[PDB]
Symmetry: D2
Subunit: 464 residues, 4 copies
């Protein structure tokens, strides 16, 4: 709305009214996040905050952005994946006068340029003092290329498992320069978003990309962590015959008890570098493989060579290197079906026969498939994650780490989670949004199990 | 040969029990793997274990594993209805002291525990405790403190017993260190959840043979037991509603596809009949308590339940349901053992054709063990492999022999290391024929783990 | 009263307590008591009955009696009787000959005690049968008794097949109602009943964890559908075998892998034809077909060690148990549970690992190792039985002239309106509320507001 | 220079062709027929008027009929169900097709008329393929002289079969028909499992709403209501089911659903007082599946929970009283086929009003309107049956029979069970399933031929 506003780059500004209509619907689906908006708007806890944000530019992220703004923050925003932006969301945010650099279908060069447009304002570093990140890419660029900016930054609030792992590695190596909150490991994040979000959105993305029947076909899910658990359910509930691979025997035990057969792409689970260690009989019967690990090369070249003709290959982990797509680019001919859907023809590199039967279907070029081929998690799930983000931003901004003397800084340089009481308060708003009614303990009951009537209700060791 | 140091229902059930133990051994690869692994080393040689836990076939395989590793034991059940009499017979016939039968009275329950503590009228030379619920642990602390001086530790099975240990620790009255066996993931997220998934609808079917599909259930609680219990009923086609005091657990119930409700209007339990959601409770065909808390199916709830509803409890203790109110006010008609019709027409007599009754299972005691056989061998494999590792560790640590200054540093309630949790899990996975993938060194490097594990930080929730 | 034989008459009070509970679970059947008690439509009926002597059958028996009938009763399986139900029925002065654990010889003796009273044929005039055994004995050994019987009401798929074979052969002597193919029987009992009771029986017999293990269900008709769901809902990885490609299509769409014990599905009699890799991974095999030898000797030899074998079809020849009696050593675990040692015939090692577990000696496992279907499901089947008994009794086929008998000799089903009326009482038992069409809506879809709501061709 | 078509955008043809080639690999029964019959050309001389959703799946059906010798002229049977890339691919292949996504009612009627007429005169049609009966109705009302030369109708769906049986009852049906709907590989495949796949699909594409944990009411529990109820329950919705048929209601209970009525005691007397307001005020999503009229009526729409989603997956939009909503409430388009209906009044709305419903596809079939309908591997079964039905009626040549023989053949019939089984077998092989072959002894034991059929015609599966 601001006169003359040009400080953005999006696909199509004319999508803004549609984006705004969907933001208004989403607000009604996000009671925890809108509750925080209503509760804290008057107090303006983020007045003076200048937030660099790097997370999938969806309608759900739009509601998050406008909550931070309504609480007083200024922001400059980019997406954390080349294919995850909803162009109507980016348009509505830019049309509101909020700097955003994001569109569906960026090149890698454009992706990096978008992050840098958040970091730079008018050719010079913005006076940022907060960071909100999803996967650690903006965190990495600041530390690597703009270290002096971190001298003014009070904290990082990191959304996802892969990003937390990168923060923990930096902390252990002494290279993290500001404190962080691990938003991923709130229960109303990890055990909501990572699991139930993928349950909703994995089969959604496969249907939108291929319109394949899933019932009666064979799937292999690589990984059975939170995303693998949700992904396996997304497919089993459609009637797929789902097999699960894992390296963690505890997660494998859960998959067995959950009714899945646990298998390995490699004979006896051992990859010895050769095609002979591939279980070709197993891979020759798989119609769909989904990677969920956060690890590297878990659907490798030899597996891709052995998959059943016309199998679908996709990744719902944060980064595309779960699958060896580089091998497929090097060796096989790609036929675009429509955006983010490619047939990969195993007959050769140069041409392909339009009627060749020996191809695989790759979704979102191996990038996060739920966001690449559909719209990621639904608003009512992202509500939990993004309520935690707002609370984490408020906490670190109020702590003012950048203003402490060097001695006090060493003491607070940590990666922490939000306290369980706040996790419970977020969950309560989510439950109320379904119309659920939580029972209140009597005093005698709360004494009996050793809790306060108001919570928290579990020790910090509890796993849910 | 000359063995009389036991008390069971019927020793002639021993051959039957032995046949079922031999089957159970083939369903318990983690526990039988520990037998093979440690039999030559005899890590429990010299251990003298007081054991108090449901005297089932699965507990029989645990006992014989401890004995095969060198231990001597004296055993009792931790519930009056949970013993399988053929299991107790097989154990006694093997020359092992066991005092347990299905259908004990409260007095007999206490006498059975005392027969493990005392031998020939004097304290046994016990030096280890294995407990399920804390009753043996409490009796030792209140009545036999001199015995605790020589006891190296307690390995506690279940959530309720852990809570009691932590209360003693907080108050400075815990006298020996403990391992919380419950919170291994191969226990809590296997036994507590999947075991109740298997055995709740099992006990309900054996007790009543009621169709469950199409009927309305209310599960009180959505912890590990409440999660498994709700799945037990939902997979049968029940329409399951869930009650909770923990909004995070309630959030999971919502996302898992259940409607979350309270027995009380707006969830406020002010003690009045007016606070009961009578419309809701009048539609419930089955209520199951799963909390470990007190009076979560209270008298006013019982008064308002739909005629002929089934009432049962799968938490550790019967006081989850106000059965005392029912004993005081209503007439009980035994249908068969552990199945009572409770007639709400009054306390003195009943009409055999009265329609206004509830069906109570196991007099409100743990229903999976009271009306069926508790969890299956292949699930208990996980819990009891952890039990054996925990016994080995505390016995080898020899707390009772440490100087006072060193005892002060080791008096705690700990869990097993994650590496051992994973090793138990791998044996369970192999039992299903599952094939775990091995990380390459670069993949292990990439995610920050050793190739052999552990694979997750200790904060990980699974 | 001494005209009965049961395991233990002192179980009568227990059985009566369970009958009173069952009545509250059987609203369609108890509704028939209330509504026809005044008319006494079965006054003068003398019913020979042959069906599993369960608590559920007890409520059926007492409904027939409440409507005016006399009966003489036996079980249709050696292991399906609940001894407390038989005791209660006997204690009520009703002739019944049935106990759990009959021998084959005793089974036949029991049916004969219903046929005979004081050493001569009873003056029976109605037949209620489950599986066709009593029907067959009457035609083969007591043909003159059929001259006085107005009809047969047959419960189950196997019995109906046998009825149709006789009709086709011109050897059926009295008309019959196929109770099996009411929708409130076939698509309730055969399917949902096995869903409730198959996992129930396996748990009672073995207490095995089912989650995470591999099952093979042979067949995917109504029993195979319900059986597959019984196992899948427990977390088994279920594979389905079928000869009918339409049923196999349903299994695929329902989320199962469809496999054959034989390579390429071709059962040529050789061990070479067995898919040994498949069978060596199966922890549980369940037959559901009503066919012969669908779990055959070569399959049994190839099965994974310690697999469970059971049958939930009507007859035990679905599994080649005779081969196992001939060749392998049987170790009873407890009643209706046997370890079958594949090490040889004469003796076994108590600790041998190479055995299979057979439930109920291959007889119907849900009734043999548990209690069969639950009351609220059997409500549907047995309401249809009562209505079919009333319908045939009132038509008095035995009294017709020879010419009117030829036209009257058939196998029929009950009309759809009655099927719907049974269903309505079942729905109300769940507290369900059925909506009533407006006149305009009924006109729009071409039905009466009263129904029937579907053409006779509709498959639900 | 081919111009005998009308589609949204012919330049979508290449994209449509890529998707047809994928769909062929997902449709083994239909492509099996294409390969089996191509040499014989059993439809040589057939001239088929076709009216059915112009999807990619219909494209494979069309090209199978053409490959077997037929000529066709095609339109969609719903204003929102066409996939424009499918229509473009068919037109670019030289096949007359008049269809686009988003037709008006007038355009819909014009498209059917463009198949019926060629160069302004009746086409020399001799076969009809219909989905819902609209083309069949127009021919009987307006083009009887064309029906004299038509050999048969093959009708896809429950609603259209009902319309055929009404005509047969009334003595107004002019040519015989095959009820394709009631093949088991159609009714118990397409109607049920197709809606299982595509109902939650269309709701997600229209709204992106979380379904887990929310309350749904499914009106009806026939084949479509069974599949729809499962579509929502498998996502974690809490599903309640309404029915007028107590046998279908019994199935719903046994399947684990609570059976409820929108009306107190089930009595629909037309009053607001009759609405169970407590029930409707808890419902987040209502789906109609009945083929009936006004089963989501104005008084239910008034009582629904704020922001509930309303949609219909039966053939026609009159299942929901959208006319009432047009007359009384303000419509706000969110995006194509998604409207907020503001219950605050007719004259405009507050952009931030909280009291609205979300209507999908303006009440038209939601799986096709907001997504792509059933998937190829499911439509394989329905469309293999269509091809077989077309061959059968075309070979019978009803239009050339004498009057006395027509009278003996004027009927609505289903395909024989042996064909139903052979279609199913190709579908099972497409999954890699392995069907067992009976031994001679087993075939004798159950009284069937080793090759089938395996069930009596009375069998319900
Ligand atoms: N697409 C989404 O919307 C979304 C949502 C949340 C998280 N994520 C991403 O998904 C990834 C996984 O997240 P998570 O929370 O489930 O983490 P997690 O640690 O809970 O689970 C990852 C699992 O992969 C297993 N694994 C690792 N290497 C393997 C291998 N070679 N073979 C088989 N299994 C292997 C591990 O044992 C572990 O259980 C991360 O990149 C995370 O950032 C994506
Ligand atoms: N029967 C069995 O085989 C078996 C197995 C394992 C554990 N247990 C016992 O079951 C009980 C629960 O164990 P757990 O591991 O699930 O514990 P938990 O802490 O994981 O779960 C208990 C749940 O009850 C809830 N709760 C407490 N008070 C409540 C109230 N008034 N209304 C509603 N919900 C309420 C809590 O919020 C919690 O989520 C303990 O007694 C434990 O020892 C029994
Ligand atoms: N135990 C119970 O409570 C119970 C209940 C109802 C019926 N039954 C009995 O169960 C049996 C099946 O009854 P139903 O109603 O399902 O009959 P059905 O005709 O519906 O199903 C039997 C199925 O077996 C399949 N089949 C036959 N031979 C096969 C083979 N060699 N391999 C694989 N599949 C094969 C057929 O194709 C058919 O689909 C009958 O004997 C019936 O009397 C038992
Ligand atoms: N969208 C799709 O892809 C698709 C697919 C197949 C069929 N259809 C259409 O869907 C509709 C239903 O087809 P079907 O095969 O399920 O029909 P069906 O006859 O099998 O089921 C319709 C059901 O609606 C019930 N019903 C009727 N009026 C009712 C009312 N007022 N309240 C509640 N229930 C009521 C009937 O009792 C019946 O069980 C038809 O119009 C058909 O053409 C749509
Ligand atoms: N819709 C969404 N918006 C933002 N981040 C997401 N991560 C997963 N789904 C998402
Ligand atoms: N079968 C079993 N044996 C011992 N303890 C148990 N707790 C639950 N089930 C049990
Ligand atoms: K979304
Ligand atoms: K057990
Ligand atoms: K029963
Ligand atoms: K489609």
């Amino acid at each position: 709305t601001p006169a003359g506003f040009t400080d953005y780059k999006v696909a199509d500004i004319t999508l803004a009214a549609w984006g705004r209509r969907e933001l208004i619907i989403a607000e009604s689906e996000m009671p925890a996040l809108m509750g925080l908006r209503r509760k804290y708007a008057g107090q303006q806890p983020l007045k003076g905050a200048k937030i660099l944000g790097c997370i999938h530019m969806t309608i759900q992220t739009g509601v998050l952005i406008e909550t931070l703004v309504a609480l007083g923050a200024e922001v400059r925003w980019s997406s954390c994946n080349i294919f995850s932006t909803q162009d109507q969301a980016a348009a509505a945010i830019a049309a509101a006068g909020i700097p955003v650099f994001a569109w569906k279908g960026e090149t890698e060069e454009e992706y990096e340029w978008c992050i840098e447009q958040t970091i730079l304002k008018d050719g010079q570093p913005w006076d940022a003092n907060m960071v909100l990140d999803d996967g650690g890419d903006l965190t990495e660029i600041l530390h690597k290329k703009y270290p002096q900016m971190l001298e003014r930054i009070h904290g990082i609030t990191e959304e996802t498992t892969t990003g937390v792992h990168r923060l923990l590695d930096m902390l252990k190596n002494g290279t993290l320069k500001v404190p962080a909150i691990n938003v991923n490991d709130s229960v109303t994040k990890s055990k909501n978003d990572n699991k139930y979000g993928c349950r909703h959105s994995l089969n959604d993305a496969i249907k939108r990309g291929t319109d394949h029947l899933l019932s009666g076909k064979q799937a292999l899910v690589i990984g059975y962590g939170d995303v693998g658990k949700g992904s396996s359910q997304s497919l089993r509930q459609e009637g797929m015959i789902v097999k699960v691979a894992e390296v963690d025997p505890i997660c494998a035990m859960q998959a067995c008890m959950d009714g899945f057969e646990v298998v390995s792409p490699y004979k006896n689970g051992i990859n010895d570098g050769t095609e002979a260690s591939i279980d070709a009989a197993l891979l020759g019967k798989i119609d769909l493989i989904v990677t969920t690990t956060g690890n590297v090369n878990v659907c490798d070249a030899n597996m891709l060579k052995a998959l059943k003709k016309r199998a679908v290959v996709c990744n719902i982990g944060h980064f595309d290197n779960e699958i060896d797509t580089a091998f497929m680019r090097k060796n096989w001919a790609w036929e675009e079906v429509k955006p983010q859907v490619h047939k990969i023809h195993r007959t050769g590199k140069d041409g392909f026969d339009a009627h060749n039967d020996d191809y695989l279907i790759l979704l979102a070029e191996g990038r996060l498939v739920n966001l690449g081929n559909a719209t990621g998690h639904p608003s009512r799930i992202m509500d939990g994650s993004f309520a935690n983000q707002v609370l984490a931003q408020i906490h670190l901004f109020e702590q003012k780490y950048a203003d402490l003397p060097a001695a006090e800084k060493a003491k607070r340089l940590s990666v922490e989670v939000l306290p369980k009481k706040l996790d419970e308060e977020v969950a309560l708003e989510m439950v109320k949004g379904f119309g659920g009614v939580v029972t209140q303990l009597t005093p005698k009951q709360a004494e009996y199990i050793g809790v306060s009537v108001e919570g928290p209700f579990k020790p910090d060791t509890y796993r849910y």
